[PDB]
RNA sequence: GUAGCGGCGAGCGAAACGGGAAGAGCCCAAACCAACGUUGGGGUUGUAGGACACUCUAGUUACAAAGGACGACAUUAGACGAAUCAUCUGGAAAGAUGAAUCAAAGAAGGUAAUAAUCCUGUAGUCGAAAAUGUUGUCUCUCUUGAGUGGAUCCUGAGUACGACGGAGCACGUGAAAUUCCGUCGGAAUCUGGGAGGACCAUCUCCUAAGGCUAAAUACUCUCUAGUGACCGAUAGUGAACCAGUACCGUGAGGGAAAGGUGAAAAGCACCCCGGAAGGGGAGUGAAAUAGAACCUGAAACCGUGUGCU
RNA sequence: AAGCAGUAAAUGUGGAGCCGUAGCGAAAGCGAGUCUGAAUAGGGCGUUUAGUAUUUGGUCGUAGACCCGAAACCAGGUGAU
RNA sequence: GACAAUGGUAGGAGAGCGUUCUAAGGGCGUUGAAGCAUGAUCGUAAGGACAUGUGGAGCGCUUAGAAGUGAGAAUGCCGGUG
């Protein structure tokens, strides 16, 4: 009922007020200390450093470069195919359709990681080596 | 607004699975005739982060 | 007479959930309008009042600091919005929640088609009283029913709502429901 | 916060694809024909168009060419508009206690305290001499349409582009394409020219060096009707009050403080002390320690009288 | 998410997009395994393979960022009573 | 019921008091609200009642929500008075 209103056990905490007096645990410094850089308004030092000693990130090396050219396969395990039905025909827009594929970057790639137990024909754009051997190793067939 | 990445530092190092991040190693650009055999051979290795150097630029890198 | 699967009007309430939901729609029709001045903002105060040291006097900057009388706020109200939202299967939990426990507490009302031709209060005022009901009722039906909306709301605690404008806040405020049968099968088709 | 730029430091930082709002496209220069350079006609492009020669007829006044008569609404004054009585306390009833009524009207404000039925109102209807705005129906005003042939002709020049010096593209001269300025040089003509991030060859897409164009977009000095878990006189605009005012400065310019009797002035007739201010009575009022220096009236500070020392 | 409908609401509708289900390598690439290497020979990082959306509290970053206080710099004006 | 622990600055953790506004429910008030003054009252603390004077119209309680939410000191700002 409306005036007999509860939340949840254990779901909201009250906040933390500073410079509220000295029995507060957090009256006089705010949790600060004394006289520093870090005492100050408007903080200290960059996240990273600031002067000093050389950065960690600036000692080390550069390395590598970046393929504009790149291909990303969807992948898809031997256990998620044991959803479909025994003589079924897999074809890329029914495993985006059935909720195995969510995004296609650049094709299908299935990889051999798991059981088959199945009987099932899979045409994809890619295969491993443990694909194609275990689905064709029950019977079935494969497309490129 | 959106949080900036550090440029410089993901030149620098890759994320690896657990969350930890992979790192090349440094003493190796020019001088070689004053570093022995065992020195250089043990320099094309890589390594990793270190949690004391992790505590101060975890936040550097949020988005890689 | 009227059967009704018990997936809706007949689940446990969610307690948790339910007062999420109130406090979200009631923090959702809430406007900030509010603002305050500050440094900047206040008129004057561009130049120093006196010069750095040699009187004795504490240092002053300008007349419109926050400790003059008459000058800046510092971290005072600014204009915003408070609404929020939460997972869509969370909306609907909630409001089957409110269904069942008003069925709980024997707040349910079917009733057959409200036959009225002309606005008249009176007539209704009468025909709630008839059936027994507390002094906050909500009346649900279809469609928007003009005849039934023109009159009934002149009467305080009494609100007309339709099958698809059922709220979280309308079912938990009112005492008791009372519904048509082509409403109740629109409300547990709509819903699950 | 990706690609990238960066004493590769601090830092800077995109576009195409996809999902939506809104959504019409057109006019000139040249070839060519007729008249006395002139003004008319013809003609507007990449699936290659046009000139010449072959059979040939939708007003878009926001671009697309530009002057006017022609009924319905909206705005600017307003008018109708339901339902209550009695007792108690009180100075006063709307409060308390009983009997009623209205509601397409229980938003709000006032009335001697707290009113759906006392008043102005509200829901719902009615209404325009005259002026202005927005739209529609004839009148009114312009109007040439598509394919086949391509002998031959036309399709924007000190322009494109290059070197030197700068700038702008997220891009600091870097391997810098794409585009702008100053100086100096300086093309091609459909078997032509440009682009696809130096550059060449092959493929794909387009056709520079003339012009015009509503809508979705940005803001509020304002007018009308409203809203708020915004302020309540050291707050809220500097300014609730005759405020950009008193005042300050040669000048540009800087800038305050100040709200509250009572329901109704019914704002104390008259007598006494005094030169007057001020007061003591008597009256008004529910109340005058509510008497205009007026609701409530705290602390600092200043006084008078008293129990114990 | 933008948008659309709705009382400046609640929530309908909207699946562009995002995180996770698989890693390793500078990259081509291969894939429960990959890189280095003549050689799983040894070694490195993975094979845990449960996340995801909203929100209370703590801390951080970008904004003046807990408050008051300079000596100064730049730009446009006013002054030879 | 038996035993054990409980000095404390910087700083970490936990549980609470009070103040203004909103929602729902339930109440008080001219037979006298808030505010102010006095009192020999209650709780472990922040603090809460009651009675009597003044005052002349509004205000508490319970459960939730949100903050311009607590002053002894900055040669602090404004007013009054030594």
Known sequence: KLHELKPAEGSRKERNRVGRGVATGNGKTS????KGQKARSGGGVRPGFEGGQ????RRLPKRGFTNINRKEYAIVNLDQLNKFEDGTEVTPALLVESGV???????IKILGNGSLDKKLTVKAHKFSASAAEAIDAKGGAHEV | PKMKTHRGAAKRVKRTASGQLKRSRAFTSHLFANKSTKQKRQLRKARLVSKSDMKRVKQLLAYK | SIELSDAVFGIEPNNSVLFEAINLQRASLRQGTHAVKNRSAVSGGGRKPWKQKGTGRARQGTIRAPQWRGGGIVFGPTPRSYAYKMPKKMRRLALRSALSFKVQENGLTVVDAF?????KTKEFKNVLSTLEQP??????????????????????????????????????????????EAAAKKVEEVLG
């Open chain 1, 31 to 34: 949790g600060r200390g004394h």
């Open chain 1, 54 to 57: 050389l950065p960690l990130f």
């Open chain 1, 101 to 107: 594929v969510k995004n296609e970057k650049s094709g």
């Open chain 3, 115 to 119: 036959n009225f031709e002309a606005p």
């Open chain 3, 135 to 180: 002094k906050k009722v909500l009346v649900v039906t279809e469609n928007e029913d003009v005849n039934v909306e023109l009159s009934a709301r002149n009467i305080p605690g009494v609100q007309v709502t339709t099958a698809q404008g059922l709220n979280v806040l309308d079912i938990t405020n009112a005492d008791s429901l009372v519904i048509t």
